[PDB]
Design an enzyme around this catalytic site. Sequence first.
Site, mmCIF file in Angstrom:
data_model
loop_
_atom_site.group_PDB
_atom_site.id
_atom_site.type_symbol
_atom_site.label_atom_id
_atom_site.label_comp_id
_atom_site.label_asym_id
_atom_site.label_seq_id
_atom_site.Cartn_x
_atom_site.Cartn_y
_atom_site.Cartn_z
ATOM 1 N N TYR A 232 7.959 -4.904 15.379
ATOM 2 C CA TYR A 232 8.215 -4.702 16.800
ATOM 3 C C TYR A 232 9.367 -5.587 17.256
ATOM 4 C CZ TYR A 232 3.155 -3.648 16.300
ATOM 5 O OH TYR A 232 1.920 -3.234 15.863
ATOM 6 N N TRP B 267 0.496 -14.569 16.236
ATOM 7 C CA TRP B 267 1.133 -14.089 15.017
ATOM 8 C C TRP B 267 1.127 -15.124 13.898
ATOM 9 C CZ3 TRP B 267 2.490 -9.313 13.546
ATOM 10 C CH2 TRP B 267 2.588 -8.326 14.534
HETATM 11 N N1 LIG Z 1 -6.691 -7.595 13.265
HETATM 12 C C1 LIG Z 1 -5.571 -7.997 13.961
HETATM 13 N N2 LIG Z 1 -4.438 -8.325 13.405
HETATM 14 C C2 LIG Z 1 -3.440 -8.702 14.292
HETATM 15 N N3 LIG Z 1 -2.167 -9.092 13.954
HETATM 16 C C3 LIG Z 1 -1.463 -9.392 15.105
HETATM 17 C C4 LIG Z 1 -2.290 -9.189 16.184
HETATM 18 C C5 LIG Z 1 -1.945 -9.414 17.635
HETATM 19 C C6 LIG Z 1 -2.923 -10.421 18.236
HETATM 20 C C7 LIG Z 1 -3.437 -11.475 17.447
HETATM 21 C C8 LIG Z 1 -4.352 -12.405 17.986
HETATM 22 C C9 LIG Z 1 -4.775 -12.304 19.336
HETATM 23 C C10 LIG Z 1 -5.756 -13.283 19.929
HETATM 24 O O1 LIG Z 1 -6.388 -14.046 19.199
HETATM 25 N N4 LIG Z 1 -5.878 -13.246 21.270
HETATM 26 C C11 LIG Z 1 -6.721 -14.012 22.135
HETATM 27 C C12 LIG Z 1 -7.983 -13.471 22.490
HETATM 28 C C13 LIG Z 1 -8.870 -14.155 23.334
HETATM 29 CL CL1 LIG Z 1 -10.397 -13.447 23.731
HETATM 30 C C14 LIG Z 1 -8.507 -15.408 23.853
HETATM 31 C C15 LIG Z 1 -7.260 -15.965 23.518
HETATM 32 C C16 LIG Z 1 -6.345 -15.295 22.665
HETATM 33 C C17 LIG Z 1 -5.034 -16.000 22.378
HETATM 34 O O2 LIG Z 1 -4.594 -15.863 21.094
HETATM 35 O O3 LIG Z 1 -4.417 -16.656 23.223
HETATM 36 C C18 LIG Z 1 -4.266 -11.242 20.119
HETATM 37 C C19 LIG Z 1 -3.351 -10.312 19.576
HETATM 38 C C20 LIG Z 1 -3.551 -8.749 15.656
HETATM 39 C C21 LIG Z 1 -4.860 -8.364 16.237
HETATM 40 O O4 LIG Z 1 -5.079 -8.369 17.446
HETATM 41 N N5 LIG Z 1 -5.805 -8.006 15.346
HETATM 42 O O1 LIG Z 2 -1.245 -4.964 18.541
HETATM 43 C C1 LIG Z 2 -2.128 -4.887 17.708
HETATM 44 N N1 LIG Z 2 -3.221 -4.135 17.938
HETATM 45 C C2 LIG Z 2 -4.207 -4.038 17.026
HETATM 46 O O2 LIG Z 2 -5.151 -3.334 17.341
HETATM 47 N N2 LIG Z 2 -4.124 -4.698 15.833
HETATM 48 C C3 LIG Z 2 -5.135 -4.681 14.748
HETATM 49 C C4 LIG Z 2 -5.740 -3.303 14.384
HETATM 50 C C5 LIG Z 2 -6.405 -3.631 13.031
HETATM 51 O O3 LIG Z 2 -7.729 -4.128 13.233
HETATM 52 C C6 LIG Z 2 -5.517 -4.760 12.460
HETATM 53 C C7 LIG Z 2 -4.887 -4.377 11.114
HETATM 54 O O4 LIG Z 2 -4.057 -3.227 11.261
HETATM 55 P P1 LIG Z 2 -4.172 -2.356 9.909
HETATM 56 O O5 LIG Z 2 -5.338 -2.950 8.977
HETATM 57 O O6 LIG Z 2 -4.480 -0.951 10.254
HETATM 58 O O7 LIG Z 2 -2.777 -2.410 9.123
HETATM 59 O O8 LIG Z 2 -4.523 -5.039 13.487
HETATM 60 C C8 LIG Z 2 -3.024 -5.477 15.584
HETATM 61 C C9 LIG Z 2 -2.024 -5.586 16.480
HETATM 62 F F1 LIG Z 2 -0.942 -6.356 16.211
#
Ligand SMILES: Nc1nc2[nH]cc(Cc3ccc(C(=O)Nc4cc(Cl)ccc4C(=O)O)cc3)c2c(=O)[nH]1
Ligand SMILES: O=c1[nH]c(=O)n([C@H]2C[C@H](O)[C@@H](COP(=O)(O)O)O2)cc1F
Lengths: 506, 506
Positions: A327, A301
């Site tokens: 959330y 985050w």
């Molecule tokens: N587009 C978009 N915006 C988001 N805002 C909030 C989220 C939630 C969010 C954000 C980042 C990550 C993420 O890097 N995971 C990881 C993936 C791999 Cl492959 C390895 C390590 C990590 C790690 O971090 O340990 C997972 C979820 C999220 C998202 O997943 N996508």
């Molecule tokens: O739990 C999550 N799951 C997820 O898929 N996204 C991704 C979806 C999209 O690629 C990005 C931005 O959301 P949006 O542009 O629709 O507001 O966050 C973010 C999370 F926190």
Amino acid sequence: EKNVSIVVAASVLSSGIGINGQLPWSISEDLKFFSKITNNKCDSNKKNALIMGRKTWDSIGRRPLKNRIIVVISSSLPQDEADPNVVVFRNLEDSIENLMNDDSIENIFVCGGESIYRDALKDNFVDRIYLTRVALEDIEFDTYFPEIPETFLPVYMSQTFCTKNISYDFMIFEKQELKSIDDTVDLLGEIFGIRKMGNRHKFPKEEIYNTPSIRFGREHYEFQYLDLLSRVLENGAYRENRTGISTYSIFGQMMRFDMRESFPLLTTKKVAIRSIFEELIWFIKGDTNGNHLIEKKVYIWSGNGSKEYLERIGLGHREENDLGPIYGFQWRHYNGEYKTMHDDYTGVGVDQLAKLIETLKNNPKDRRHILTAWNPSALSQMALPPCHVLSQYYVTNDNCLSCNLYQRSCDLGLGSPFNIASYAILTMMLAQVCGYEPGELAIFIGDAHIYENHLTQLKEQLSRTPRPFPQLKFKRKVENIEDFKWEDIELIGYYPYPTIKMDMAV
Amino acid sequence: EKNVSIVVAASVLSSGIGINGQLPWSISEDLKFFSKITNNKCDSNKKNALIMGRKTWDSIGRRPLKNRIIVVISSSLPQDEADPNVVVFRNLEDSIENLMNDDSIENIFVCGGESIYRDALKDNFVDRIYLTRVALEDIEFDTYFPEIPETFLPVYMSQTFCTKNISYDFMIFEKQELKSIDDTVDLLGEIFGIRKMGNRHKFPKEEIYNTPSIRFGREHYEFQYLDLLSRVLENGAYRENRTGISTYSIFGQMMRFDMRESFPLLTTKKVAIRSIFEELIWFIKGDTNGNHLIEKKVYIWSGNGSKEYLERIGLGHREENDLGPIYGFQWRHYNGEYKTMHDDYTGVGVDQLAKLIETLKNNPKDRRHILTAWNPSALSQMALPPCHVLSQYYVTNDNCLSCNLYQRSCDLGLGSPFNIASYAILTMMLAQVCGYEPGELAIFIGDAHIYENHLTQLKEQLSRTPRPFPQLKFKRKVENIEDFKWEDIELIGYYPYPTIKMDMAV
Ligand SMILES: Nc1nc2[nH]cc(Cc3ccc(C(=O)Nc4cc(Cl)ccc4C(=O)O)cc3)c2c(=O)[nH]1
Ligand SMILES: O=c1[nH]c(=O)n([C@H]2C[C@H](O)[C@@H](COP(=O)(O)O)O2)cc1F
Ligand SMILES: NC(=O)C1=CN([C@@H]2O[C@H](COP(=O)(O)OP(=O)(O)OC[C@H]3O[C@@H](n4cnc5c(N)ncnc54)[C@H](OP(=O)(O)O)[C@@H]3O)[C@@H](O)[C@H]2O)C=CC1
Ligand SMILES: NC(=O)C1=CN([C@@H]2O[C@H](COP(=O)(O)OP(=O)(O)OC[C@H]3O[C@@H](n4cnc5c(N)ncnc54)[C@H](OP(=O)(O)O)[C@@H]3O)[C@@H](O)[C@H]2O)C=CC1
Ligand SMILES: CN(Cc1cnc2nc(N)nc(N)c2n1)c1ccc(C(=O)N[C@@H](CCC(=O)O)C(=O)O)cc1
Ligand SMILES: CN(Cc1cnc2nc(N)nc(N)c2n1)c1ccc(C(=O)N[C@@H](CCC(=O)O)C(=O)O)cc1
Ligand SMILES: Nc1nc2[nH]cc(Cc3ccc(C(=O)Nc4cc(Cl)ccc4C(=O)O)cc3)c2c(=O)[nH]1
Ligand SMILES: O=c1[nH]c(=O)n([C@H]2C[C@H](O)[C@@H](COP(=O)(O)O)O2)cc1F
């Protein structure tokens, strides 16, 4: 000319099958599978032949198997004729006299011994391989199943099963050698273009389909995630979005996952399970302070909580990692007036999670076990609107807890593997607190997409054949759902492929 | 010995194919289908033969069809040899000389004429039937396609297509006169009981499967609803609920419907389309007064708004049919403080529908086009909590508007056919107001169930083979979505099976 099949149970990584003359595990259901697969036949006046080495013949106590004929390969054993259920041959090729004559033998099974397995594959006697993959690796082996030669291709992979916290599945390999309906559909697809809905949901091409030889046996529920990637690569429209990174996107998809016999943690990629748990308990506690995750070395985050990002979306008045009512604030204080992340919110808003837990155990068959995070009155104050928007819970008649989730937007590269494991853990937590067992997990998706800077990575992941899911167990029974700690979780039998780095779109 | 197939286009109810020596319609795509199916062949050095009566030969101008050989059945036509593409025979049986020799003829098609069709079926020459069902009935016919004999079974039914507001689909009839994977899955299902997730999702038995001979060609999207009924009858758990009427229930299902080429109004049962529209415009206007529906002779909300029901659920203070803040009050006044149904709510709450319309046309690729009705603060005041809980909308790259809906609880006998048509109309209304075309409709369901007093009725409906969907068009372009009236809607080509009466569970 009749069929010759190998039956074997081997470990998932090193293919170990034995140790000190016995098996390195004790799985009752696997022996029942061996029994059912070797007794299966069409002609009741015929029997099946089970070929095995002498050391394997010793390990089963030198006693016959009911309804079958055992063929022992040995150089020293007396070629006895007293027992019609046990016959001895001096080499494997001569024992293939079951083929050359003997019409009372319907099918042949190569049943064990690394020496027997290796010679049966080396001499190209085997048509089919029944493989039980066991998720046990950090133990000692001295006997191995040889590497499956390239002439074989997998055609079936079952779901993951669990015995004594040991994960395993079943696979079939085969040695490689009406059109009226398909033609009509093709012709209709040439006449109508995208007017025919099937042309908008084209089946993925082989080059982007994970383990393409498994056509009718994609039972392993990790294919629910992998095949969704293939559908997006095939039909995804190139679209821009709020971030600078465009995606390929489709609309309206779903994935199912079992939770009774395994935990849906992807194996084609090492998933950061600790960050997933830390985020979930962060939701459950009602927290919106982004620093508490960074203090626990969880930085997922960080991007949506920087000073530059917050000022850009019109929240410059906000503190650095104050994400607003997101959330865990709608979960515990729905419609509560949000001020900052430091204020005391005990008593404000509707506690959805507490009411969910009470109704789950006081009115299990109620059709309203719902937890929502989409609050139109608070969207403007959120650093990011909720992606996993609404979830529903269901108590089956056999006291299992299932979960449905609707996700409005799905980052398949990064977010989706987290969401699958996240709501799996949450359903398990609710199950233990309410006195149920885990059930099934279904995820319904709106905008399923792949960011264009993940294409190389996700195509790499699509080249990896899945392994059985691990198990996830709790080490103690908590008194409140907020008391769960990372030390209480035990991940058993997780052997994933190496990590795949993917950048997050801010 | 080669194949003989009938190609015909007939009306959906009376099987009319001709009038005054010509066709009763003009559908270009059907002629292209006829062209592609009669030209389709394997050997490039062979041709296909098209048998037709003399009057059909007159109706096509007596000119040959490219790449094919026309066989005219006539008693008076001169057996000319100048044209090698047109040959004349004196009877239908003699013309099947295409079989006895002539290795340059690969396939045979009986291409038209009621006299030729009737003799080809009566003498049992036909192996396959390619049928185009046209949804035009209240017009004049003088030529008919004979009834398909019981020796034929349907194996394919396409989606509904549209040409000049005319609905049609394509069907294939056939004269109905590896196992290693299936065996392994069966054996695994005997070892593991309900531990194997497949055993919790058993395929419906033939006796509860609509039109079971269509195994691989269930393309018509009404099968999305019918097959969900079959899944519930097969696997549904017997459960009690707040009403006195128990259900058979499963959890986590979905249905897809096209909206580009048809309108998903069920044909296996006559659906009260006017009541659906009147309820929907009642939602859009923000209304919660149940009398306004009763004044329009719509009584679907009478049961949940009676004095006896309201007093029973603790809302005895409310006036008769005062349903409280429900659908359409969360749509137009989300989080607004509700008093009675007589008060003025202009300005109170968040107008989700107005913001949805504005975002749909100002930011189409936004991933947040969401309309919700689940308000935890208002649930206690509602006569009934929302069933269709949340919906999301999506603008495709070709300017189509698609809709996803999550439904927490689904009365498949009464509620589900209403929900399908309701959100189809709403998406079409939103499409016109925002300047788009209708796209696709996906419905994701939590508790899908069948009330036990609907079992006889729904099994009756499952015995009816579906007909092509109708079309729904708007007669004018409104300036605001609230201006739609029942007179503005045109339902074209709806020929359903008779009504099936089912009582509502209060
Ligand atoms: N587009 C978009 N915006 C988001 N805002 C909030 C989220 C939630 C969010 C954000 C980042 C990550 C993420 O890097 N995971 C990881 C993936 C791999 Cl492959 C390895 C390590 C990590 C790690 O971090 O340990 C997972 C979820 C999220 C998202 O997943 N996508
Ligand atoms: O739990 C999550 N799951 C997820 O898929 N996204 C991704 C979806 C999209 O690629 C990005 C931005 O959301 P949006 O542009 O629709 O507001 O966050 C973010 C999370 F926190
Ligand atoms: N996980 C699984 O699916 C299975 C595991 N196992 C395990 O594997 C181990 C046993 O396998 P393994 O060590 O390889 O022993 P084997 O079962 O292969 O038996 C070996 C014996 O077979 C005879 N033999 C083998 N090849 C020939 C030949 N070319 N000509 C003549 N005789 C031959 C010899 O007997 P002789 O000395 O008399 O001449 C040899 O000693 C055990 O631990 C067992 O439990 C066994 C079966 C299945
Ligand atoms: N919707 C669709 O798929 C199709 C519709 N149609 C329509 O159907 C109508 C035409 O069909 P229809 O009225 O039945 O006429 P036909 O096409 O069946 O032609 C009839 C003629 O065929 C000859 N004939 C038929 N049976 C015999 C026999 N047993 N022995 C010798 N000759 C025979 C006769 O010709 P003769 O008098 O010279 O001896 C007879 O008059 C038209 O309106 C046409 O538009 C036609 C084809 C397809
Ligand atoms: C040591 N050994 C070799 C062995 C063990 N596990 C395997 N597991 C698999 N998946 N495949 C094999 N070839 C295999 N082979 C054994 C051990 C027990 C029995 C056995 O008792 N079979 C009984 C099974 C009894 C049961 O129902 O539990 C039968 O009726 O076939 C056979 C071979
Ligand atoms: C009047 N008549 C009989 C006719 C008309 N529609 C049918 N439609 C169907 N589904 N099946 C039939 N047997 C059929 N028969 C016709 C009319 C036009 C052509 C025709 O022009 N066929 C061209 C196609 C023209 C085009 O591509 O539109 C071809 O090359 O086959 C054939 C038969
Ligand atoms: N259990 C439960 N509670 C409900 N509350 C509110 C609804 C919504 C609701 C209520 C009633 C009806 C209904 O009778 N439709 C009809 C069905 C047929 Cl087959 C023929 C005519 C009608 C008609 O009326 O013209 C349809 C939807 C509803 C529901 O469908 N099920
Ligand atoms: O639009 C509707 N769709 C629907 O399926 N129901 C049914 C579902 C369930 O059978 C019944 C009561 O819902 P519940 O008892 O779960 O609150 O209403 C009601 C509607 F108004």
